[PDB]
Symmetry: none
Subunit: 533 residues, 2 copies
């Protein structure tokens, strides 16, 4: 790729240290390319967040455009803005995804969560866990959110301190061999216990066993997302190591509050930068209005109890090829290759000219000058329609370049559509109808190995239905409404890309989804082989 | 915030910094200098890394002064130093040629010493096992000195001979422990045999309330860094015997023999010879400076020498070591010599003063060489010229001292090599007529080295010291080699500075004024650098 060059300045040596940490990589030179090390925009945000703790400033854009430490060190400035380090309290306007959430009027709205389980061979100290979670919920203000009704309207309120920060539970499983089902059953019960009006939105359970402890964490989706989880794992590891060393628990400086973010986004929603996007989104709505997804059984209003999860794994070799080597061929980003595979799959499996997919993005785009949310806990996730052309699948090189072209044309990684749909004043929405209702969701959460696998703890092998993706069966009420016909969710855990196809048995036969998922696997492997051959 | 280690390298470095510096919990963003670290402690970090078979250059720690940064420059050790017995000839290094060149009366009585104390008492059998392993392991301690046709020859004995002289004193039934240790250690200091005998004296003084362990070593085979390695290996050996483990000391770094040999080559290489114009420039300026003396007196002897001491209390000492260097990005010698300059400016009519500065001498001049854990006399001495005219404002004088120090090539190690080892055909017209009148010798910090789980610095160290101030180290018949000898160290969390002078050359009141001036100026420098 390029020869090892050691750092030669304070700034370079700090960037090398940050990059080694964020990526899972032991020795990085200052001419090593961020993307060739497997970097993506989430890892770029993580570098920016860590830099902030040295009072050094960088935007996500700087890193991905100048993708080596030697180049990017020029753009590194001193932070001149200090974010609010105090207690955040009071009203927080509903952000776009929060308006979508409440708009769906889900049955058991209080049971719509993300979760994970951590494992520590040496066991966890319950007094330390409680000390660290205290500091975490004090520091990450949005976790203290509650949801009230004024006049049938939802009001989001950020509590101050002094109240219930989390519910803590301890289970002694040290004298029974059914640890695995005991964690599955107890975590399912805890998932059902979220009080949106009052109680905390964070559930913490220690399971003590003969051979190590597990720490379950469940958080209502309203106050968290995938980046937020990586920050929480970081502050859990830091705080735990600080307590073990007899040091005060002390977490990095706060970035901007979810409250301030949401407030600025209310303003952004009616400013020129976003409204410039309307002609793109109108063109998209015009070109997608008729597209429709075929099903095996015509059924209305499916529930999560009807949903089944079909998983595809790429082995470590093909995963590392995808993350590190594949993008170099056509200068793509990983979403270009994953969506190229998705197109080839729908072209094979269906007779449609075109498919509209609901794409998720991290949604921490630099849309607001002097906003920094690189280390802020909250639900920032964006969702936006993408039209995949299915007609022109050959040759493979043209279909990749075409997918890349489609993705490059989208304004500001699609964050604008949901702002237009849920916040922008009606009079500023041009002729947008917002009638595009994708029936296929694609959600690549990104990489978690460096966040979850630390010196103190790791991803529990008994995570079971407690996951960060929409596939974990414990995260949602069985009575919750299905919000997409095909939910395709993926992440990198244990060195492998794991893609789950979630579907209603009441809408599709298993066979139909085995064919779609086998087609996706075959074409993604062909893209990786093509790009690396 | 405390930032914990993340990798193995970061973890070995936390552990090493905590032991070297004597700080309990160190984070990976803690600044080496802010924790009170200087270049001696950087050398001790490198020596300890070497014991883990990890390689670091001192300058990498000093330019990247946090554990997270310095870990990026830690590499696997490629080269393994000689672990076997060292034997045979060893060329005289520069300070050793200076020493023999002085032709001191009673040259066998020119020592460094220290006394350790252990409340539980010392097991004399464990002491003798540990010292056996120490003198087997630290080869230079077995050196001997002979004339071969009126020329001094230095030989590193192998094993099997006398490693050290051991003595034991039962003082458990008398109140006069303090005077008995002073009188007995003074006798033992007189007993070094340069031709054959060990150059290590070990005395156990047993008392009703704990024991004292006296160590004396002829200066020819030891220095300040060497003493710290000896304290470390004594603590390690003694802890192993207590746990009933084999006594086992870390890996050897390069022998004094090898080092002296490489030095003979470095002395006629271009890098060194390049410094000659710098050194002949310093010699030129030095010719003009004569230190005033209350009495013009010839051939003074150590028996005329009197010690006048000042101490900075712990709070001031801690500010100097940890918070003062930030102000103008200085090193500790900058602030100590700025104070010396202001002291001499106030005390004398001179426009400039020439001081002989001492340094540890373990500079990275020889790329093969690793002496980070080697026992020997490495000390460098070099002239430094202090401006006594441009003394205000204080901020300008600190910056001016720093700039003066920054123009010195390779921490002054070159001057003595040019003076004593470089072939006369390569020496330029260097006169070496620049006599030591004022010596400044800051030995550095010893609390983390001497204060251990097993033992500590004895309150009855008395005239047995690592500095030249200790009255027992030198024969009363030894010639004074410097009119004003200013020796400093950190002990008991305090900077202790001694002004040693011949009572034949100065009134006590004269040295009272200089030492009080020094104290006032250093206190003023510390308040200035930390008040702002």
């Amino acid at each position: 790729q390029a020869a090892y060059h050691p750092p030669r300045t304070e700034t370079e040596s700090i960037l090398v240290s940050i990059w080694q940490n964020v990526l899972g990589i032991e020795k990085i030179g200052i001419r090593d390319n961020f993307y060739s090390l497997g970097g993506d925009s989430i890892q770029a945000i993580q570098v920016v967040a860590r830099l902030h703790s040295y009072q050094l400033k960088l935007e996500t854009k700087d890193l991905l455009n100048y993708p080596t430490i030697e180049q990017v060190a020029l753009f590194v400035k001193s932070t001149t803005r200090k974010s609010d380090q105090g207690i955040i309290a009071g009203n927080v306007p509903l952000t776009p995804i929060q308006k979508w959430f409440f708009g769906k009027n889900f049955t058991n709205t209080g049971h719509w969560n993300q979760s994970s389980v951590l494992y520590r061979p040496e066991g966890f100290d319950p007094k330390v866990i409680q000390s660290v979670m205290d500091k975490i919920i004090e520091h990450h203000d949005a976790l203290r959110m509650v949801y009230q009704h004024e006049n049938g309207n939802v009001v989001q309120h950020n509590r101050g301190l002094g109240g219930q920060l989390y519910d803590f539970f301890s289970y002694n499983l040290t004298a029974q061999p059914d640890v695995q089902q005991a964690i599955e059953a107890e975590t399912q019960r805890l998932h059902s216990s979220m009080n949106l009006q009052e109680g905390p939105l964070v559930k913490v359970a220690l399971f003590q066993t003969l051979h190590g402890d597990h720490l379950f964490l469940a958080i209502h989706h309203l106050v968290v997302d995938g980046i937020s989880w990586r920050i929480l794992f970081e502050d859990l590891a830091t705080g735990y190591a600080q307590a073990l060393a007899g040091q005060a628990i002390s977490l990095p400086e706060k970035t901007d509050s979810f409250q301030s973010w949401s407030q600025w986004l209310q303003e952004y929603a009616n400013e020129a930068d976003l409204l410039s996007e309307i002609p793109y989104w109108e063109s998209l709505e015009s070109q997608a209005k008729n597209v429709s997804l075929p099903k095996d059984y015509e059924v209305t209003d499916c529930k999560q109890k009807s949903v089944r999860n079909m998983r595809i794994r790429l082995h470590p070799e093909e995963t590392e090829q995808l993350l590190k080597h594949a993008n170099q061929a056509y200068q793509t980003e990983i979403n270009d290759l994953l969506l190229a595979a998705l197109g080839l799959a729908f072209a094979e499996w269906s007779k449609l000219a075109q498919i509209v997919i609901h794409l998720a993005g991290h949604g921490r785009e630099d849309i607001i000058e002097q906003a920094n949310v690189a280390r802020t806990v909250g639900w920032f996730t964006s969702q936006y329609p993408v039209l995949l052309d299915l007609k022109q699948t050959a040759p493979l090189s043209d279909y990749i370049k075409l997918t890349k072209e489609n993705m490059r044309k989208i304004p500001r990684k699609g964050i604008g559509y949901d702002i237009l749909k849920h916040v922008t004043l009606p009079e500023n929405r041009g002729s947008l109808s917002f009638r595009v209702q994708p029936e296929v969701t694609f959600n690549y959460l990104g990489q978690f190995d460096a966040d979850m696998r630390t010196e103190l703890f790791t991803r529990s092998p008994y995570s079971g239905g407690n996951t960060l993706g929409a596939d974990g069966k414990n995260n949602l009420s069985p009575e919750s409404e299905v919000y997409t016909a095909l939910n395709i969710t993926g992440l990198i855990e244990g060195g492998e890309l794991v893609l789950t196809f979630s579907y209603s048995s009441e809408q599709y036969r298993e066979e139909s989804i085995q064919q779609l998922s086998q087609s996706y696997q075959k074409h993604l492997l062909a893209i990786i082989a093509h790009c690396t051959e």
